[PDB]
Design a protein around this ligand. Sequence first.
Ligand SMILES: *[C@@H]1O[C@H](CO)[C@@H](O[C@@H]2O[C@H](CO)[C@@H](O)[C@H](O)[C@H]2NC(C)=O)[C@H](O)[C@H]1NC(C)=O
Ligand SMILES: *[C@@H]1O[C@H](CO)[C@@H](O[C@@H]2O[C@H](CO)[C@@H](O)[C@H](O)[C@H]2NC(C)=O)[C@H](O)[C@H]1NC(C)=O
Ligand SMILES: *[C@@H]1O[C@H](CO)[C@@H](O[C@@H]2O[C@H](CO)[C@@H](O)[C@H](O)[C@H]2NC(C)=O)[C@H](O)[C@H]1NC(C)=O
Ligand code: NAG
Ligand code: NAG
Ligand code: NAG
Lengths: 202, 90, 49, 87
Amino acid sequence: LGKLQDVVNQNAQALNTLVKQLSSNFGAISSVLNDILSRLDPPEAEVQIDRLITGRLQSLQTYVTQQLIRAAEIRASANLAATKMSECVLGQSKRVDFCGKGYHLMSFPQSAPHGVVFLHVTYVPAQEKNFTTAPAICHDGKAHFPREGVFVSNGTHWFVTQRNFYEPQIITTDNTFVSGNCDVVIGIVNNTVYDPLQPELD
Amino acid sequence: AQKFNGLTVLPPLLTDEMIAQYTSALLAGTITSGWTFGAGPALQIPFPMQMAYRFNGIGVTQNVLYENQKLIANQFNSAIGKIQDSLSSA
Amino acid sequence: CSNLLLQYGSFCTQLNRALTGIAVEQDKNTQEVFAQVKQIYKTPPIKDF
Amino acid sequence: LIGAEHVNNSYECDIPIGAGICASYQTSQSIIAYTMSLGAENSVAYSNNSIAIPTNFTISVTTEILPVSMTKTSVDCTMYICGDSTE
Ligand SMILES: *[C@@H]1O[C@H](CO)[C@@H](O[C@@H]2O[C@H](CO)[C@@H](O)[C@H](O)[C@H]2NC(C)=O)[C@H](O)[C@H]1NC(C)=O
Ligand SMILES: *[C@@H]1O[C@H](CO)[C@@H](O[C@@H]2O[C@H](CO)[C@@H](O)[C@H](O)[C@H]2NC(C)=O)[C@H](O)[C@H]1NC(C)=O
Ligand SMILES: *[C@@H]1O[C@H](CO)[C@@H](O[C@@H]2O[C@H](CO)[C@@H](O)[C@H](O)[C@H]2NC(C)=O)[C@H](O)[C@H]1NC(C)=O
Ligand SMILES: *[C@@H]1O[C@H](CO)[C@@H](O)[C@H](O)[C@H]1NC(C)=O
Ligand SMILES: *[C@@H]1O[C@H](CO)[C@@H](O)[C@H](O)[C@H]1NC(C)=O
Ligand SMILES: *[C@@H]1O[C@H](CO)[C@@H](O)[C@H](O)[C@H]1NC(C)=O
């Protein structure tokens, strides 16, 4: 895991750098402040003490700025994770390529140390077949358009299937609607409609 | 320049050329397949099919595109010319 | 000048690591935007759309 | 770059270098440098009366990694900056 390891390693190395900062003189003649107190008088060793104060203050200010920036990016990541929770897990999100690569169904959150993961369940097609399509069917001068599917042909006859699955069905009135005349679409094909009311009225 | 004082500029990992190649491949995917290539394998589709599907996505029935497809194509071409002319004029 | 820089080598290490992080995140920003697909789709020679 | 031979073929790279060229360890075997391959160069057959309707699906699971918190630390000047001295 990379996104959960850097947030710990960078913090650990920042704490280690803070520890290492006390081992430097910052231009003074000793690192520990007790040494100059023991070997030099406080009236004379005031400037070295003040230099150590300035160096430690600069190191603390740099660490505070770094921690503020890390907290800002952690806040942004937490807001993103909360939105991903509330959309992908607590419902189904219509945003494409947001809850994983594919058509999202649901996500399963899992606890993580100083983090969170989401177990997205996507819907990707596996096998596809090439087909010849047409926007409209000219039956009796009226152009038929699919309500939710698309006209497809296997070479001899025509069917209508949904967008993400191949479910061939007979061209009928229940899944098609008419609009206008036949001479409005640049590409149209001639066929017939089942009209499943005609055989039942006999 | 600004490199004489050692303020060295790191070259990017991706140059302009393969960024342009990425954009061209994405354009080809979105004009030849719509959104199938962004959520799985690319599926071939006619462009008016995709246009009617985008129209269906905003609550407009797909029967209106094929009745005035030339008008929508001319409007799209005019809009492309307009954005090109506006960008040429920062 | 380099002799007195051992007292602030920790500061220098922090600055160098910060710029290295800036550079690597600037590199990764382009990968998260343009590299959405892993297959380069060629434009068909037919321009009749 | 020294210590890595240059080869004209292109693969997917793992160690980035910059300016569109990477380095990797392939076939004995030695470190080679090559231009990174943006992906599988394939063409999609496009036609005004050709469609592709999927007939099967695979339920896939995608892993995402997101941190939400970090270790809460408290720092005080008096026992960091100073030791056991009043001055
Ligand atoms: C295209 O689809 C049609 C409709 O399903 C197929 O025609 C049927 O094929 C089955 C398979 O032997 C026969 O039992 C039926 O009697 C056929 N019905 C009609 C009305 O012909 C056709 O075979 C399919 N063609 C291809 C190439 O797949
Ligand atoms: C689809 O059907 C229409 C009408 O049934 C056909 O249009 C006819 O075409 C013939 C000769 O091609 C003309 O003599 C008729 O006057 C046309 N009628 C109308 C109403 O336009 C059309 O040709 C058919 N298309 C195909 C490919 O068979
Ligand atoms: C859709 O894909 C799945 C996954 O490969 C197919 O399921 C396999 O079917 C074969 C033969 O029927 C079996 O030997 C495997 O054990 C099945 N695998 C699993 C994981 O169930 C399925 O048959 C495909 N469907 C169609 C219509 O092609
Ligand atoms: C369908 O046929 C066309 C050419 O006839 C081909 O380019 C395409 O790859 C085929 N589709 C599939 C899924 O095999
Ligand atoms: C598809 O395009 C080809 C080439 O321009 C053309 O010959 C054919 O008539 C077109 N088909 C339709 C249905 O528009
Ligand atoms: C790679 O192939 C090209 C093809 O012409 C050739 O010009 C070039 O010299 C080759 N590079 C190497 C390193 O062999």
